């Protein structure tokens, strides 16, 4: 899948804006993804911060939302909303050693619930480490949730919004 890169290290309003445009440039907002070959159903967003930690988010091209991610040798996926997506996510991060699918979904209402939230470069920097260390036992679920929310609002939601105002 196409890979968009972004780092919080030396981040500018400009580097961030181009990042979002890039994402938006690959969306195909439709009621739900179907007809799209799984080959191009997702965008991969590689995020890295000042500690040089990197995680890769898998975004659904139809609605821009995060369906899962990769941190090093492990991958995590939100409980798919149905069977098509269930089988779809099996195509993501295939060379990864550890695969896990959460029992809960990745909608805002669930994440808010699990979280028990300032946005910005600072919070994203920290959200990236949280996502990374989750895979080694250093991140508690509530923090993981708050971190997903930060990634989702600053990336998924930002691209959707611009896509829409783009359609006037």
Curated annotation (Swiss-Prot):
What does the record say mutating residue 59 to A/M does?
Answer: No effect on the toxic activity or the vascular leak syndrome
The membrane-spanning stretches of this chain are: none
What does the UniProt record report as the effect of altering residue 61 to A/M in this chain?
No effect on the toxic activity or the vascular leak syndrome
- Glycosylated position list: 5
Residues recorded as binding AMP, renumbered to this chain, are 65-66, 106-108
Q: Which domain of life is it from?
A: Eukaryota
Q: Where is the active site?
A: 65, 108, 157, 160
Biotechnology usage? A deglycosylated form may be linked to monoclonal antibodies to produce immunotoxins exploited in cancer treatment. However, a point mutation should be introduced to eliminate vascular leak syndrome, a side effect resulting from endothelial damage.
Q: Where does a carbohydrate bind?
A: 3-5, 10, 35, 121-126
- Chemical reaction(s) catalysed: Endohydrolysis of the N-glycosidic bond at one specific adenosine on the 28S rRNA
Q: What does this protein do?
A: Acts as a glycosidase that removes a specific adenine residue from an exposed loop of the 28S rRNA (A4324 in mammals), leading to rRNA breakage. As this loop is involved in elongation factor binding, modified ribosomes are catalytically inactive and unable to support protein synthesis. Can inactivate a few thousand ribosomes per minute, faster than the cell can make new ones. Therefore a single molecule can kill an animal cell.
Tell me what this protein is called: Ricin A chain
Q: Which organism is it from?
A: Ricinus communis
The organism's taxonomic lineage, starting at the top: Eukaryota, Viridiplantae, Streptophyta, Embryophyta, Tracheophyta
First-to-last residue of the parent protein present: 41 to 223 of 576
